[PDB]
Structures are given as structure tokens and as C-alpha cells.
Write a protein that binds this ligand. Structure first.
Ligand SMILES: NC(=O)c1ccc[n+]([C@@H]2O[C@H](COP(=O)([O-])OP(=O)(O)OC[C@H]3O[C@@H](n4cnc5c(N)ncnc54)[C@H](OP(=O)(O)O)[C@@H]3O)[C@@H](O)[C@H]2O)c1
Ligand SMILES: NC(=O)c1ccc[n+]([C@@H]2O[C@H](COP(=O)([O-])OP(=O)(O)OC[C@H]3O[C@@H](n4cnc5c(N)ncnc54)[C@H](OP(=O)(O)O)[C@@H]3O)[C@@H](O)[C@H]2O)c1
Ligand SMILES: CC[C@H]1[C@@H]2C=C[C@@H]3/C=C/C=C/C(=O)NCCC[C@@H]4NC(=O)/C(=C(O)/C=C/C=C/[C@@H]3[C@H]2C[C@H]1C)C4=O
Lengths: 354, 354
């Protein structure tokens, strides 16, 4: 009844390149009106995600506005025409805030370069989640990154027995999940991680290879490693990097190769905006590049297919999806800085329980 | 069975960039052994093609060897196990030679940048060709260039009623062929030409807009021309140029767009090897670029479907595909140089009746 005090991380200052996490965000205590519309709801946050692509959303965020992010919430209060009743556990884009008010409807990301539209709020069912498939997973293998990997692999990539596969950024959850289904469909999987230790992790997961981009800073050194990592060329490629790794990949594309472009760390974070033209290398191969935007998939029928196919496999230990959950609402911008600095200590999907 | 005297245009000198035709080719007279293998044939040449991709075939061809090219041939004498009997009209890569011997089996072009294998020799069936679809068109609409355009449009691109479509290099036969098939599928077709007339010529063909790259050297000057020619963004794009023009397209790709990359005149001829990284422009669009290499379609099943589909449209004038047939064996390299120029006589497929 009335109002309540919440806390938000809000954009203090726009800073390009690798984020200066403690200089860009600022915690503030905001008063939130708890008088609700016909279809609004009051939500408490239980978990938030922190992903490298928040780096872009930050640059498009107006100063002072809370930093958006993928989150798990719980309905505290609900309007009369509310999409969800109280208690309901939902997954959505509540951002870095302890509380918030929302109609839950799909809304337009007006400030974007591209007119993005955050989906509506997915209702969650506790029954699906248990000790082995925790509720914390609706942000990973049972949430965003898992939809991205499973989708690319059922809806776009026909992986065949005998394919060489390259997964740039294989360390993260999406990279690792992609590689697993790659091997699962009987495919030589090659990866990239950044520390010798992370290397063994993937290597323990079935990665027939890993590579240190840290020690392969020019596309030349990289082609070298790659020709050896993939002695039979490249059949499929799930890219989240670009710039030098990708320039080398395209130079060995088998015929009928598929490429899925999921992100471009090189261009986005490290700001490599000019490079060698890759389009001329795809013609003779008849490669098929596709841009990935996993939101195109957040259909109700689609979420079930993930639980149904992915959910089982995961709980039978057959499919690995670790999640590294840091505690405390206040450490959120610091968890965000680990993706760009202390990621060697990170294993799987980074989250924060609030 | 003795010998015979022939004439060949042979690669005298490699010159990258725009070809210097009278400096690169040298007419020569070679004597040909008239003893045939088990599956070989003696071939007299009737017509030859001249295409811009011959700029590449030239640069990989060893100095002194005949210039390969698309041709129409006729069996003079044939071994016992020949794929075709004498008198038969065959279509293959006989190059700029008055005569030649060949078994017609597929052969490998190893000295290339990419290790291609020229297809097997096609027999031409007179029933297909008539006054209105002359035998010469098996080098144009009824041969390679038509297969490329028809393939890309039946096998890859779903154009819908109401799509904007872009065609780089829209002047040539494939581009003009492509734009036309688009217009039939209810598609606003936008093109690029080099002369006020060539632009009108396309406009006469159904092109809802045209733009002069001759004026638009900057992706910025281009984006502007483009943003206005394609006010609703780009739904499909048939690329044969690249560089500044493609840079401008990717900056306005609609959602679900398809791209067919067929050639890169800019990269190939104009040597534009580095430019802005385009992959960041395909993720939100969920663009689906595919490289085009029409050779994958050289099946009998397909050639019949081409004649059956394209031949009809063409003979009822619903589909226009002019051919500028220059006569005379000696005039071949000069007929080649008509591309690479501001000739309004460069209308349709350039050929040489020998
Ligand atoms: N397109 C879409 O619709 C969509 C949807 C969701 C996510 N995504 C994106 O897809 C990616 C995968 O997600 P995730 O959760 O698994 O992220 P993630 O892989 O954990 O992202 C950070 C990781 O990337 C690696 N990395 C950093 N710089 C690198 C470089 N120069 N070369 C190679 N690897 C480098 C590091 O691995 P090491 O620790 O081994 O260095 C680090 O741990 C993310 O970028 C995410 O934003 C896209
Ligand atoms: N991948 C495959 O399997 C495959 C198969 C066959 C052909 N191809 C290639 O695809 C291309 C299309 O064939 P085509 O018969 O239609 O050739 P074409 O377009 O007639 O080739 C020359 C024409 O391109 C134009 N041009 C030159 N520079 C340009 C620029 N900067 N911007 C825009 N247009 C420019 C000129 O048109 P204006 O006269 O208006 O200036 C010129 O007349 C050829 O290069 C061919 O080699 C590929
Ligand atoms: C319910 C949450 C859902 C996420 C919400 C937003 C995320 C978008 C981030 C956008 C960044 C941006 O525009 N930055 C500036 C442009 C740079 C660059 N260009 C791109 O086209 C691009 C991308 O497509 C990036 C896609 C990420 C997809 C994410 C969604 C998946 C899903 C889990 C880039 O990042």
C-alpha cells in the first residue's frame, strides 16, 4: 500500500571499450510507487544475469536510468487485469534493481541503434526446477543462453557426423553448450578459451581442442593454430568474437559450411571496426552465414521444447551447465567486471542472487 | 589421322585490375593432333562468351596457355566411348580456341586461388532453341548466367510480394535477370548503373529505382542515395559488387533479410580488400547471407527446369535478356573489353559468333 524503497544501479557515465564497472554504474535508493495499474505488478528480484552484451545496452542507456539485465523476479502485488498473480516466479528484463513495477508486456527499446523489443515476461514453474535443475537456471541453460545454443543447433545448424566445428568464446556457457551438442551429434569440436585452466575445463567436456587467443593476437598466428586444430577445414562456426579469429576461419571454410554469428566481442568491446573483407571467401565454399538473435525464439512452445529436450539430458549429468552465482545485490557491477578481467576464476554462467 | 591448324587467343601477360585486353591476349596458330582417345572428341567452336570473371580466370592461367572461357562447340570426330556423337552440339569451357580435343569429363583448375573443377560438358538439344531463343543463348539466359540467376531465385531467395530488393551490378545479364524475377514476385527492385541511359534501360525493364555508383563513391554518399531509393530498408540483396555499395546495404538490412553474394567486382577488379566489418550488422536483422557458386546446379534435372521455366517466360517476352553478339574470332578480346567501359552497347550477354 503506497510506496517503498528500492535500490538501483544507474548509468553514471558512458565509457566505451572494456567497461570501467565502478565508474559507469552508481547505486542509488529510489522510491517506487506501489499503487498499481489495471495490469501492472510489483516484483522483487531474486537473480540477475550479467553478460558481456550488457556493454552495448549500457552505451545506449540514458544517464540515470537503471541498467537493464536479464532477471528472475517474484510477484509481490498484482493489478486486477494482471498477467500474473502474486507468488508467481517470472523471468524477464527487470535490470539491476532490487524491486520494480511492470505490466510485463513486451516493450520497445527506443534508445537502441536497432529497434529492439524486449519480450513479455515468461512465467516459471518451480516443479520444473530441483536440486539438479535449480530455479537459478531459468537465466542459463533453462533460460537465455541455453535457448541460444539449443536454437542454433536445432533450428539452424545441421551438425553432421564428421564435421570440424569451431566455437569462438567457448568458455562461456553458450560456447560450451554449443560444443557439447556438436560432439553429441558426433562432430570434432574445436574451441577457444583464454587461460590454460579454462582450456582443461572444455577439454574435460569433450573439446577435442582449445586455443589461446591471448597467444594468438594476429590472424596469422591464429590461422596457424587453426589449420592444425582443424586439419580438414571448417564445417560449422559459432562466432562471438570476430576481427582476427574470424578472418582466419573464413580462409578455410569447407563447402556447405554454416556460420552462426552470435556476437562480435572484437568489434563491440575492443572496437575493431575495419578488417579484411570476408564476403569474397564465402562464395566458392557456398557458406551460409546467419545472424543470431535468440529473442526470435522466446515462444511458449519453444520454452517447453528446451525443458523437454534439454531439461532431461542436463539432469542426467549427460549435459554440463555450470553456473557461478555471486551473492549480494551490491556486488553486481563487480560481477560485471569479471567477464572482462577476472574471468579465469569464472565457470559457466555468471549470475548474482539478490 | 594427321594434324590440323587452329587459332587461339592465349594469355600473354597477367595484369591485375581492369584488364588491358590487347596487352594481355595474343592470337596464335597451333597445330592440333587429330588422333582421338577412347572417350575424346574433336570440337569446332561456334560461339564464345566474355564475362568479368574471366578477369580472374586470366590471372591464374599460366602465361602462354589459351584463355579459358564459356563456349558452344560441335563434335567433328569422336572416339568410340565418347559422351557425345559427332554433329552433336556441346557446351563447355572450350576457351578462346578455334578447335580443341576433350573427353568432356570434369577437370580440375588447380592453379586457382580456390581448387575448382569445371563441370562436365552439356549437350544442347535443338528442340529447345528457336528464332526467339537462339542457340547462342546457352551462353546467356539459357546457359551459365541464367542458371546463376534462376538458381539463386528458386533455390535460395524467397521474395515476397512487397519486399524491397537490391541488385548490385544490375546492368549485366545476371543482375538484369535477377531484378526481373524479383519484379515478378511483387518486389520493389532497386538497381545500380553507370549511365543515365543504362539506368533508364533498367527502368524500362521494371526497375523501380536505379542509382549511379559512378557518383556514389562513399558509403555515406551511397547510404543517402540508398536510404531514399529503399525507404523501407532492404529485404533481399543480390550482390555482385561489394565495397562501398554493400557497406551501405548492410547498414539498412530489414529483419529476416537474405543476401546472395555472387561476385565482388570491387574486391576482384578494384582491389578493395579491406573495409568496415559487416558481421555486426546481421545479428539484429537475423540476416542470412549465402555465397553463390552456380556450378552446384549444373544438373540435368536443373537445366531442364531452367529451359522449362525461363524459356517460356523469355519466349513470351515477359522476360527480356538481350545479347550483344559480336562476330569474328579475331574480335574476341575487344568484345571482352566492352565490359569495363561506359558503352551503352554493353546490353545483355556479350558473345562472339565464330
Ligand atoms: N545474439 C544473441 O541473441 C545472444 C543472446 C545471448 C547471448 N549472446 C552473446 O553470446 C556470447 C556467449 O554468452 P556467455 O554467457 O557464454 O558469455 P561468456 O562466454 O562468459 O563471455 C565472456 C567470456 O568470453 C571470453 N572472451 C573474452 N575475450 C575474448 C576474446 N578476445 N576471444 C575469445 N574469447 C574471449 C572469456 O572466456 P575466458 O574466460 O576463457 O577468457 C570470458 O569468460 C556473449 O557474448 C553474449 O553476449 C548473444
Ligand atoms: N558465382 C558464380 O557462380 C557466378 C557465375 C556466373 C557469373 N558470375 C559473375 O557475376 C557477374 C554478373 O554477370 P553479368 O553477365 O551480369 O555481368 P555485367 O554485370 O555485365 O558485368 C559488367 C557490368 O558491371 C557494371 N559495373 C562495373 N563496375 C561497377 C560498379 N562499381 N558498380 C556497379 N556496377 C558496376 C557495368 O555496368 P554499367 O554498364 O551500367 O556501368 C558493366 O557493364 C559477373 O561478374 C560474373 O562473372 C558468378
Ligand atoms: C530477454 C533478454 C534477451 C537479450 C536482450 C538484449 C540483448 C541485446 C543486446 C544488444 C546490444 C546492442 O544493440 N549493442 C549495440 C550494437 C552492437 C552489436 N550489434 C548487434 O546487432 C548486436 C546484437 O545483435 C546483440 C544481441 C543481443 C541479444 C540480447 C538478448 C537475448 C535475450 C537473452 C550487438 O551487440
Amino acid at each position: 500500500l503506497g510506496s517503498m524503497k528500492t535500490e538501483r544501479w544507474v548509468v553514471r557515465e558512458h565509457v566505451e571499450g572494456v567497461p570501467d564497472a565502478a565508474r559507469i554504474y552508481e547505486k542509488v535508493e529510489t522510491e517506487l510507487n506501489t499503487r498499481l495499474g489495471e495490469e501492472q505488478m510489483l516484483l522483487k528480484t531474486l537473480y540477475v544475469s550479467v553478460d558481456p552484451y550488457l556493454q552495448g545496452i549500457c552505451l545506449d542507456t540514458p544517464i540515470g536510468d537503471h541498467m537493464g539485465a536479464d532477471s528472475i523476479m517474484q510477484v509481490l502485488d498484482a493489478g486486477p487485469n494482471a498477467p500474473f498473480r502474486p507468488g508467481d516466479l517470472v523471468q524477464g528484463f527487470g535490470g539491476w534493481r532490487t524491486h520494480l513495477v511492470s505490466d510485463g508486456k513486451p516493450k520497445l527499446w527506443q534508445t537502441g541503434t536497432f529497434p529492439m523489443v524486449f519480450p513479455a515476461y515468461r512465467k516459471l514453474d518451480l516443479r520444473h526446477y530441483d536440486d539438479a535443475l535449480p530455479l537459478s537456471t531459468a537465466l542459463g541453460v533453462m533460460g537465455g543462453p541455453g535457448m541460444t545454443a539449443w536454437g542454433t543447433m536445432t533450428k539452424f545448424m545441421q551438425v553432421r557426423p564428421g564435421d570440424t566445428v569451431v566455437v569462438s568464446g567457448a568458455s562461456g556457457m553458450i560456447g560450451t553448450l554449443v560444443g557439447q551438442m556438436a560432439k553429441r551429434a558426433g562432430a570434432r569440436v574445436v574451441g577457444t578459451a583464454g587461460s590454460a585452466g579454462k582450456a582443461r575445463y572444455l577439454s574435460q567436456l569433450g573439446f577435442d581442442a582449445v586455443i589461446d587467443y591471448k597467444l594468438a593476437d594476429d590472424a596469422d598466428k591464429m590461422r596457424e593454430a587453426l589449420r592444425e586444430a582443424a586439419p580438414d577445414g571448417v564445417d560449422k562456426y559459432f562466432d562471438s568474437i570476430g576481427g582476427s579469429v574470424t578472418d582466419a576461419v573464413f580462409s578455410m571454410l569447407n563447402v556447405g559450411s554454416q556460420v552462426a554469428v552470435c556476437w562480435q566481442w572484437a568489434t563491440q568491446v575492443q572496437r575493431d571496426y575495419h578488417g579484411p573483407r570476408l564476403l569474397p571467401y564465402i562464395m566458392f565454399p557456398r557458406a551460409t552465414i546467419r545472424g543470431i538473435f535468440s529473442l526470435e525464439w522466446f515462444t511458449e512452445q519453444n520454452w517447453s521444447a528446451l525443458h523437454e529436450e534439454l531439461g532431461g539430458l542436463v539432469r542426467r549429468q549427460e549435459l554440463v551447465a555450470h553456473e557461478t552465482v555471486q551473492d549480494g545485490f551490491e556486488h553486481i557491477p563487480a560481477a560485471y567486471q569479471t567477464l572482462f578481467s577476472a574471468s579465469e576464476s569464472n565457470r559457466g554462467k555468471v549470475l548474482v542472487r539478490v
